[PDB]
Structure 1
Amino acid sequence: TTFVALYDYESRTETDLSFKKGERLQIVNNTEGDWWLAHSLTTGQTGYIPSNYVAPS
């Protein structure tokens, strides 16, 4: 339930969290679900999606 960072991470956008190796993090349950990097076979566009918006074929 409480995780520890193994590496530094520097934020690349306004929505991600920067953290330093050793920081203690708690995951936030939320309605979007985990986010996955995805590719649209319909549009050819690519980027992150909220997993709770999709289902398997």
Structure 2
Amino acid sequence: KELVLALYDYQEKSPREVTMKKGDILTLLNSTNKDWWKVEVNDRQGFVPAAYVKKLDP
């Protein structure tokens, strides 16, 4: 599992988007789109803005 940190709150604005709160840790599913990254939290899989998350690499 690759992980991302929510840097800012994000409210879903379309059907395939996921809501997150600042500080949330999410599983990264796909980062090939420059603008939107696919993530996973709980039973949800969808997109958040790439600029709102940071990859958690040492």
Q: What is the TM-score with the length of structure 1 in the denominator?
A: 0.49
* CA radius of gyration, larger in: 1
Which structure is higher in strand share? 2
Bigger relative contact order (CA 8 A; separation at least 6):
2
